[PDB]
Amino acid sequence: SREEVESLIQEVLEVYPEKARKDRNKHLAVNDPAVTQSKKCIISNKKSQPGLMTIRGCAYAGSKGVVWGPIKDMIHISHGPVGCGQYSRAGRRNYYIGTTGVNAFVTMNFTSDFQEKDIVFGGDKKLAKLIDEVETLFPLNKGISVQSECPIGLIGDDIESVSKVKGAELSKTIVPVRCEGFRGVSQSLGHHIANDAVRDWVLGKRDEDTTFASTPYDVAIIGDYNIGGDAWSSRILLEEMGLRCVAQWSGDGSISEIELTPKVKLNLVHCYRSMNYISRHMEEKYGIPWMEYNFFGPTKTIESLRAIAAKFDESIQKKCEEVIAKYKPEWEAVVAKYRPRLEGKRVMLYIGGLRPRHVIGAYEDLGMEVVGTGYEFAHNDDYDRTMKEMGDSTLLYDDVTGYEFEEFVKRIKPDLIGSGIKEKFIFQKMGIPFREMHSWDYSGPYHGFDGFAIFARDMDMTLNNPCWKKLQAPWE
Amino acid sequence: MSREEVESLIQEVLEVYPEKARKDRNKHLAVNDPAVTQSKKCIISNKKSQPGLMTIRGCAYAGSKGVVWGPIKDMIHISHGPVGCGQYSRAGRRNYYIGTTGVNAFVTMNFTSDFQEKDIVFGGDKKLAKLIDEVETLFPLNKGISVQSECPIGLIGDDIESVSKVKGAELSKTIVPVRCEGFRGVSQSLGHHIANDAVRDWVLGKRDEDTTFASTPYDVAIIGDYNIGGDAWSSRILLEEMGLRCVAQWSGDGSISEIELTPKVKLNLVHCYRSMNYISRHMEEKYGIPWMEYNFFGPTKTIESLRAIAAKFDESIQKKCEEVIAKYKPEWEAVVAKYRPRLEGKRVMLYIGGLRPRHVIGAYEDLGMEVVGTGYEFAHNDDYDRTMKEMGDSTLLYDDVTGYEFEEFVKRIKPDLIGSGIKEKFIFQKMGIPFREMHSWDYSGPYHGFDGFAIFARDMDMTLNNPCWKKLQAPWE
Amino acid sequence: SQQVDKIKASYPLFLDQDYKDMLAKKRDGFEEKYPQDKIDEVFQWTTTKEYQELNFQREALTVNPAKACQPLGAVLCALGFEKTMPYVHGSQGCVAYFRSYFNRHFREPVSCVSDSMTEDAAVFGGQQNMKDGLQNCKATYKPDMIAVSTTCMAEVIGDDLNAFINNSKKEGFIPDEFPVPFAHTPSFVGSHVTGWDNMFEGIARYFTLKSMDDKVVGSNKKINIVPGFETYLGNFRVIKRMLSEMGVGYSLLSDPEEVLDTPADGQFRMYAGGTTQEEMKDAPNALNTVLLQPWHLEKTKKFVEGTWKHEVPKLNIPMGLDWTDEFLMKVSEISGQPIPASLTKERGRLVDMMTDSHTWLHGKRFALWGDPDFVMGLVKFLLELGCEPVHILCHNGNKRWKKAVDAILAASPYGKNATVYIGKDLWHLRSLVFTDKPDFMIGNSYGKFIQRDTLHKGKEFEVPLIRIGFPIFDRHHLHRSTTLGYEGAMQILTTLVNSILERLDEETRGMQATDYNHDLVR
Amino acid sequence: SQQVDKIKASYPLFLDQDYKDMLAKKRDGFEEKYPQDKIDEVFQWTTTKEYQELNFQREALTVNPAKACQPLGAVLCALGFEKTMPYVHGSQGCVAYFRSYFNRHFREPVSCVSDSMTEDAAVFGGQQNMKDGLQNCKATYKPDMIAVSTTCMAEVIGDDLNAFINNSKKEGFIPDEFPVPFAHTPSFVGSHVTGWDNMFEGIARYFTLKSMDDKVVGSNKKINIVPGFETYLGNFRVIKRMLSEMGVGYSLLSDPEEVLDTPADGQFRMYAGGTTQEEMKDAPNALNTVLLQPWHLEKTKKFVEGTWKHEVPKLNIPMGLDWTDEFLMKVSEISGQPIPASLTKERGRLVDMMTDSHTWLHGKRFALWGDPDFVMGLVKFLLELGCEPVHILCHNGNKRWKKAVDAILAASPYGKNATVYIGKDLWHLRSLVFTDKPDFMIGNSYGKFIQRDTLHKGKEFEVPLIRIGFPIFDRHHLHRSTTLGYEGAMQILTTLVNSILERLDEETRGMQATDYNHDLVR
Numbered sequence A: 001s002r003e004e005v006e007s008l009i010q011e012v013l014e015v016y017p018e019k020a021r022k023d024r025n026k027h028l029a030v031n032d033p034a035v036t037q038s039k040k041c042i043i044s045n046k047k048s049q050p051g052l053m054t055i056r057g058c059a060y061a062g063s064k065g066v067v068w069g070p071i072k073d074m075i076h077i078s079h080g081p082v083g084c085g086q087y088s089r090a091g092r093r094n095y096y097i098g099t100t101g102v103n104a105f106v107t108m109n110f111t112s113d114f115q116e117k118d119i120v121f122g123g124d125k126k127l128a129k130l131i132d133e134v135e136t137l138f139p140l141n142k143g144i145s146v147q148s149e150c151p152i153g154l155i156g157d158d159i160e161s162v163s164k165v166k167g168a169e170l171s172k173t174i175v176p177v178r179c180e181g182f183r184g185v186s187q188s189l190g191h192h193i194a195n196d197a198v199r200d201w202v203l204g205k206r207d208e209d210t211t212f213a214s215t216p217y218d219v220a221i222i223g224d225y226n227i228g229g230d231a232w233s234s235r236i237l238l239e240e241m242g243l244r245c246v247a248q249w250s251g252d253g254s255i256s257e258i259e260l261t262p263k264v265k266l267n268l269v270h271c272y273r274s275m276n277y278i279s280r281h282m283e284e285k286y287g288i289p290w291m292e293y294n295f296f297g298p299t300k301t302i303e304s305l306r307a308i309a310a311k312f313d314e315s316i317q318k319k320c321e322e323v324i325a326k327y328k329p330e331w332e333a334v335v336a337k338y339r340p341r342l343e344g345k346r347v348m349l350y351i352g353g354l355r356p357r358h359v360i361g362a363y364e365d366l367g368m369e370v371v372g373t374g375y376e377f378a379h380n381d382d383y384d385r386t387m388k389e390m391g392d393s394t395l396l397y398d399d400v401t402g403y404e405f406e407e408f409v410k411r412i413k414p415d416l417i418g419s420g421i422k423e424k425f426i427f428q429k430m431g432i433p434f435r436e437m438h439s440w441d442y443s444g445p446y447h448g449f450d451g452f453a454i455f456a457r458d459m460d461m462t463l464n465n466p467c468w469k470k471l472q473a474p475w476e
Numbered sequence B: 001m002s003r004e005e006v007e008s009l010i011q012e013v014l015e016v017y018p019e020k021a022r023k024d025r026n027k028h029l030a031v032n033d034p035a036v037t038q039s040k041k042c043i044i045s046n047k048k049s050q051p052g053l054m055t056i057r058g059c060a061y062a063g064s065k066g067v068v069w070g071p072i073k074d075m076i077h078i079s080h081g082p083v084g085c086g087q088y089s090r091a092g093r094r095n096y097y098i099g100t101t102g103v104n105a106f107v108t109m110n111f112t113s114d115f116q117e118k119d120i121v122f123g124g125d126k127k128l129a130k131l132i133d134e135v136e137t138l139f140p141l142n143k144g145i146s147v148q149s150e151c152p153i154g155l156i157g158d159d160i161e162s163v164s165k166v167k168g169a170e171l172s173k174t175i176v177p178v179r180c181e182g183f184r185g186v187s188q189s190l191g192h193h194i195a196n197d198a199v200r201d202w203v204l205g206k207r208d209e210d211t212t213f214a215s216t217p218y219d220v221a222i223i224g225d226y227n228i229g230g231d232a233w234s235s236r237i238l239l240e241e242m243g244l245r246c247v248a249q250w251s252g253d254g255s256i257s258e259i260e261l262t263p264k265v266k267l268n269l270v271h272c273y274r275s276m277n278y279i280s281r282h283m284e285e286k287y288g289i290p291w292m293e294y295n296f297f298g299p300t301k302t303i304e305s306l307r308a309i310a311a312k313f314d315e316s317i318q319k320k321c322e323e324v325i326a327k328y329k330p331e332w333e334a335v336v337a338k339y340r341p342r343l344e345g346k347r348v349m350l351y352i353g354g355l356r357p358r359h360v361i362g363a364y365e366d367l368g369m370e371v372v373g374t375g376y377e378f379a380h381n382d383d384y385d386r387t388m389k390e391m392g393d394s395t396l397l398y399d400d401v402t403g404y405e406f407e408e409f410v411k412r413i414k415p416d417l418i419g420s421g422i423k424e425k426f427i428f429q430k431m432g433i434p435f436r437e438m439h440s441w442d443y444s445g446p447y448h449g450f451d452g453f454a455i456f457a458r459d460m461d462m463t464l465n466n467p468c469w470k471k472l473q474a475p476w477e
Numbered sequence C, D: 001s002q003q004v005d006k007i008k009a010s011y012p013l014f015l016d017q018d019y020k021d022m023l024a025k026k027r028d029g030f031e032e033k034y035p036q037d038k039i040d041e042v043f044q045w046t047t048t049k050e051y052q053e054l055n056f057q058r059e060a061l062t063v064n065p066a067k068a069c070q071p072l073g074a075v076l077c078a079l080g081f082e083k084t085m086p087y088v089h090g091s092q093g094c095v096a097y098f099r100s101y102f103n104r105h106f107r108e109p110v111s112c113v114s115d116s117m118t119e120d121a122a123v124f125g126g127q128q129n130m131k132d133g134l135q136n137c138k139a140t141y142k143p144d145m146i147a148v149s150t151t152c153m154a155e156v157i158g159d160d161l162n163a164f165i166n167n168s169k170k171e172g173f174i175p176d177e178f179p180v181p182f183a184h185t186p187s188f189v190g191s192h193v194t195g196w197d198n199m200f201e202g203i204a205r206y207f208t209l210k211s212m213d214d215k216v217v218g219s220n221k222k223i224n225i226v227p228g229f230e231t232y233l234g235n236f237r238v239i240k241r242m243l244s245e246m247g248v249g250y251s252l253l254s255d256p257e258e259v260l261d262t263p264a265d266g267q268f269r270m271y272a273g274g275t276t277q278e279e280m281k282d283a284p285n286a287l288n289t290v291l292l293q294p295w296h297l298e299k300t301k302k303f304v305e306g307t308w309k310h311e312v313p314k315l316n317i318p319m320g321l322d323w324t325d326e327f328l329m330k331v332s333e334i335s336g337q338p339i340p341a342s343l344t345k346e347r348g349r350l351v352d353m354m355t356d357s358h359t360w361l362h363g364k365r366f367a368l369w370g371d372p373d374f375v376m377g378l379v380k381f382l383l384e385l386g387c388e389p390v391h392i393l394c395h396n397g398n399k400r401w402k403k404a405v406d407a408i409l410a411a412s413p414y415g416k417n418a419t420v421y422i423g424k425d426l427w428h429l430r431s432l433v434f435t436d437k438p439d440f441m442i443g444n445s446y447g448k449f450i451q452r453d454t455l456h457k458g459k460e461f462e463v464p465l466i467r468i469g470f471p472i473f474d475r476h477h478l479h480r481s482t483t484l485g486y487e488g489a490m491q492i493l494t495t496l497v498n499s500i501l502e503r504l505d506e507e508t509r510g511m512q513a514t515d516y517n518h519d520l521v522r
């Protein structure tokens, strides 16, 4: 109940020194869907307090790991010392089709491996030489991006001049990205920086090229990074409905299909957080409308398909109803098998900037209740959307600390937790089923009708696993 | 080590025995004398083993099923009796073959009548008749069945000959009863003889009146090569390069048809004298086919064998023989050049079954090694006749050696390498003595022929000169 | 031909063109081989449900058994006793095979004698073989005890073991006081595990039957442990480790772990370690006796309860989580010793590993075979991991045991697709993995030919073998591993999940075809 | 589409025809992909000696490195101290990555904080982050000690760690007595192992630098053990076990084994076990200090010898037979304690396994990589087994380490074909395993992509990966294994020979083609 949730927040905050207490209070809230502006209840997108074990990453993760890294036929340089690119090598399951090392390069780690001489004298000469070596040893790459790590902006390197000069010399696309980890407060500013880099260096290359012919049905999937194949199980529904998916940003994405995107008729935005910036740009510059949609679970997928079709003519609306009729026995069979196993179970979530609200409908399609949710780096407009999706008097947490999250869980006692790899092994030891809701725990896809079957199978297999009844020894 | 030191070694080892075993084992131990014309004057062989002394011998079933019949690849062999014998002998012997196992070839499978007590009490002939029907149903491509008798069959008075006769006539299939129960004989050796006679009586004559096979003057048969690690294939290739046509291999990779075609060949080439001389003598008596012994271990013996074989044909085979010898000369010369400096002067003790204890001596000598002791589980006087000629003077010979004897002999002689079997292997490694299995080839091979000598040399070097033998004493001891 | 710097053994030597051409001419010239189309047609038939129906109608033919015969178990039992020579009264071919069979599994010497009964003994009995054999064995190999079993020849002809041994002592071939326990071990009854049971009961009788007046239960404050036929060195070790960790006084009755694991230090040790004769003579003074593999210790149990008067508890084999739990708790109850913090923490680490790996294990389907206690315990642990044991084969199992395993399957939803087979062999099982394909087999080395058969039908039909059981001949040193207790459960769990992940890596290694799922992280 | 009772995940879902057709349409329609003929042609070129020469001419580009950065090692070092919170002064993105990286290898929680320096700290320094960070961390997570390392931003802007920490205590953000050892750990110098050395020396200094007057060498009768950067739990445990077995008093300095292996018993333990502060304060009173991984403990050695005045013995990492021997002998000499019969026997059992497996190991050719001490110990043991290390890669090695390993190779005939590479990465190694193909790779999970590449050329060119090292992300619970001592040598040997036998089985599994060599017994 509301009063009990507020007392819970206050009791957990007691451990903090005064300064941290006053700030963390602004980031914890009891849901109120009737409030028109979320900033009146919860504050977000602020600096993390020092020493409290935030779960956030940095702008390089938001740029290299999230937006640019999945683009499959370009080579992305982790520019700076060796650590960043090694820890982020192949940790994110942005799936693609390619011949890795030959024409696609996603799971490789290219780096300038800065040594002390590079810090002291600058890395611009090294970057120039590295680019020539890339061109010799990977001749089928279709472009290079330069993903700046922390020291680049600190030592005063000019990667923009390198990219302009070398790009002219070799007639190749070289994209400088200033996503140093000290910028911003989280992955979020990295998204924005990465969007602006696409805008400034790539997206306009075909503005004067009129060889590609549009159709009235051309769309682009904006903000789906194909985790476990999510975007493919989305694309198949859109093209069964009669549309033509010209581009995927950026899961399984090629640089050409990015350059073809200003030719589409409608931008379909899944991840609003990471890609609303470029969607707004394309509306302003090219007049392309954009719309948000949601492909988690049958209720939202059906909702989305119909809303998308309504932007087109009668033939697409007809094909939409034919797609919905095709899959109805499939997801009804998923519900009939798995909803009785999961009904009434309560879940707490903590994820990045989209899924903490976007997966709610999928859990509700299996009879489960989301009793607490939060984000690492969402903004006010994400929370605007969240309070409408979550039930009254549920718990919301922004940039939750390791300590808060453990205390919230202990009091609330959810049946399932969905969060990340740094959270997973904490809560299994407490006897609480846990599902990774970034990596899908090496399963998926979860998007679409085909993904719902896997999602339902996965929540059942973990929540109801026999191992959870064995944690207390019979002699204790 | 002098002749007198060896004789005293024998007497000292024997003092541990009770009187009856002492007097018997003395007859089976000897210092070699190559000049004695009959080996039985120096060493006794092919007698019962003494009870309780840990002989290394097997039984007549191993000699029949494990050795002679088992390899024949397109027949199904029933281990007839309780479950043990066929399970311990399933795929333990590396008699290699080409086939589709379970469909048209069956060598590494274990077929058995799995006798229970009701089969002991009331007899197994009815069960054998039903088993034969079940085999025909579930394995329709088999080209014959053999019934390999285990110990209880002749003890309980079963009549598998009449079952094989009645069922063989019912289904018009070849069914071979083999009375190789393990209580017969004293070793594997009588199993060979029983198996040879079973081939003679039930298979070998079946084409006596079929004259449709097209002979050539150069048709031979390889007799007594069981294709361990591919040995028979690396022998066959040389015979056919020399211009001969190998109609049959007995019995490694062997098919029942090529056994039935063997009475049509012009010369039987005998490798294993011990196991197959019986049928060779029969084929000479019945069909007039001459037979000769040969040896494909090492270059010296292989070349000598090729020339002795080619001399029985015309000048064209003799010409191709010299052409084969010239082709392989740089190959085995390169093997000696690499491996003889690593092995020269090293001393070997051997203990094997009925042929290799003498047959591999030349191969060791081609690498500069010396065989200082050798012996057999189950050889006969004619085997030792051939052995005393091949071993040096004053070397040690042991027939049906006991576990105690062999360990004591090894401790005194201190060989650089021991070549024997799986039951010996792990004893002598603990003592820090390099050991090579000379039955299974330690899962390597082939060793026959020119291609085999390269593998033989590599294997003796890799084990004798392995770094692990320098490491058995802890540095603080 | 050979290149001296790169010598080829049989594989790949015989893939050379000149060898391939020679083998083609041998086949065409003289083998009268069935056409390959016919071979293909028959192989495909052997994978069908039609063939499976005929296969399961066999009454007389056995093909590829999954059992051995009684004296093999008697030999292994005997080896666990101090300075004890196994001695099989009967024909010598048997002992050659017993020794080689154990040689290849343990990669150790295996000492065992025969008394070499031949046709002369077939006619007039083996009494003289026993007389001379006992004297020759004692003088030559100087054991402190000779444990006598029998081959099937000696059972059929009906040699009176008791009278023969008694006469060997009466006529001076061995001292009257030299210990010669014996057991009849007919190969046509039961299996190898039964010979273990018979040998142990005979050794226990020899040392305690006529000595009971002096004994009182519990007076030595120990618990007897009887391991049964056991071919993993780690299982002897983990039971002794856990009991000592608890501070529980115990006596492991038959302990071959030292003699099956001697160091290579320059000397061969025919004997090492083993249960002492005094430990058998004093065993009735224990608090109780725990049988680790009770489904092949029924004769031992009747003697321990009827003569020692021990209230042997009804424990399953201590495999998996629940049954290791119950074993420790019963030992604690009997001994009065609490379960220490070190074992409680070990238990928790196994559960932690179960939480870690449960998503890859869930729903995985298995065929498996082995001896009854081993198989039952493997079934129970698979259920605890959320796996589905689909084909459960125990050639030497019986109907009582099958009832018990069916009840274990009925008590978990992961058992809904399981069937238990008794008295069936590995040719039956081959049909089952074709007609109702599981993900893996768990079994001994004979399973490799089934995997080979499944792959021939096609890569998508292949059922990979996970090697757990006896014998394991084609890998080295797996006999050192553990299957009992928390330690064995951890080892089995790790093997199972990494088998799953190895195969998934194999299936996703094809570039631009399946390597979209070739994840760095699993 | 999905069939609800056989749900397909990404593999094999996307092999369905409608998904295949869709992906072909995406490629042809919008990806402007290079023709498959060109992709095949370029791939073949990357396997050539021509490409290798260009590859090894790289001076600026690094591709697929085999090292990480300093603070990762500092965090691991700090985790081995009782109730100690790793704290990386600098930017928070680093700590998310450090934690995740270790999460995936150990499958355990990894606690570590940042003080979240952002662009403001970049302009004005990070002193306020350190003040509030230390107070917040101590208040919220209640550690007994905070071990401070640095991210590269904090190094570049030149934050004075000592002054910031001193000011935090002076201004009252934490108590003056509260232990806050620190170390500078720049990612652009050395590698993750250097961070471990730097952190350890910092902690050692904190507790002993200003307190040396009272100490006397050998007065506590213990031996200090410093493990270095170590990610196998079995390695901590085998060293402690062997010293306990000898009765040798020891202190293991940085011992994270408990906090990296907590049980799943209903509660999360942020801290568990660890080296105590009192052990660090008392360490100067030991007889001596042994460094288990000397090639990345060089700053620690200078301090231990310079300030504690310990005569640190010249020992290699205790891997394989010879170097485990030398380790035990030196411990015996220092401690005066004899080597017990139990360890002598264990040694003899390792040698026994070497004699058992030598015919399959002989001449086998390996490519391998890792940290310097691990790599040289693996090289040494491979020589002892009669294997041929061929490509030896140590990205973070140095020139005098290479000279030492070259001398090890020159002393054995099995070293004749070996080349040591330093400062080269896994893209260099990929070229080597194409142009001079070995039988196997020994390395971490990043090796799987090289194996994938080699298979794409052809099954006969495939080089299978054997996973030993760090990180291992795509198998479960291998972090529990051992590589040190006789126990680790046995585990490595068993893995190597069974990897050989597994591959031989795969190559001989083809019926009527290669299965003539599909032996039951090996």
Ligand code: ICS
Residues within 6 Å of the ligand: A062, A066, A092, A187, A225, A227, A271, A273, A274, A351, A352, A353, A354, A355, A356, A437, A438, A439
């Ligand atoms: S991009 Fe974002 S943290 Fe929108 S940085 Fe993060 S693959 Fe999360 S909640 Mo990892 S805003 Fe995508 C995300 Fe969501 S990496 Fe993935 S799961 S839908």
Ligand code: ICS
Residues within 6 Å of the ligand: B063, B067, B093, B188, B226, B228, B272, B273, B274, B275, B352, B353, B354, B355, B356, B357, B438, B439, B440
């Ligand atoms: S058949 Fe004989 S014991 Fe001649 S029973 Fe034995 S495969 Fe030996 S010395 Mo094993 S008379 Fe062949 C033999 Fe020699 S099984 Fe092999 S190696 S050359």
Ligand code: CLF
Residues within 6 Å of the ligand: A058, A059, A060, A061, A080, A081, A082, A083, A084, A148, A149, A150, A179, A180, A181, A182, D069, D070, D071, D091, D092, D093, D094, D095, D097, D150, D151, D152, D153, D187
């Ligand atoms: S916040 Fe982000 S991940 Fe951190 S450094 Fe900065 S861009 Fe990068 Fe990199 S090398 Fe190591 S992991 Fe860091 S200390 Fe530097």
